[PDB]
Design a protein around this ligand. Structure first.
Ligand code: CL
Ligand code: CL
Ligand code: NA
Ligand code: NA
Length: 129
């Protein structure tokens, strides 16, 4: 599913991401735009052989099991395919674990390079939330 901007903002609010660990909703919408273009099906392979999955591009080396990333961890205890669902629950629940692991949203490269230090509230402007 390819979400609209405000549709995704509302879904992420419903799932508790607004101000989660101090990150306002616009931060999460901005990260999703540049990680996946709001597409839950997005996948991208990394140089080390791991793969990123879903709307927030969660990496199989640490967070999910895809059966082809040797020695990796599954810290969210889920198959990576679960992160491609039109229902964002699994992606949100795993992202909550990631953002709490000490580095905040700096775990998402696109957030650090394209969202951090910008007017992220613009990503929720106009939306009914
Ligand atoms: Cl959803
Ligand atoms: Cl933080
Ligand atoms: Na915001
Ligand atoms: Na893994």
């Amino acid at each position: 599913k390819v979400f609209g901007r405000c549709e995704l903002a509302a879904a992420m609010k419903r799932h508790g991401l607004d101000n989660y660990r101090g990150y306002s909703l616009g931060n999460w919408v901005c990260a999703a735009k540049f990680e996946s273009n709001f597409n839950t099906q997005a996948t991208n392979r990394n140089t080390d052989g791991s793969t990123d999955y879903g709307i927030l591009q969660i990496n199989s080396r640490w967070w999910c099991n895809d059966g082809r990333t040797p020695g990796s961890r599954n810290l969210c205890n889920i198959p990576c395919s679960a992160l491609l669902s039109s229902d964002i629950t699994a992606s949100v629940n795993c992202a909550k674990k990631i953002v709490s692991d000490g580095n905040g949203m700096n775990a998402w490269v696109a957030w650090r390079n394209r969202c951090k230090g910008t007017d992220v509230q613009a990503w929720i402007r106009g939306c009914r939330l």
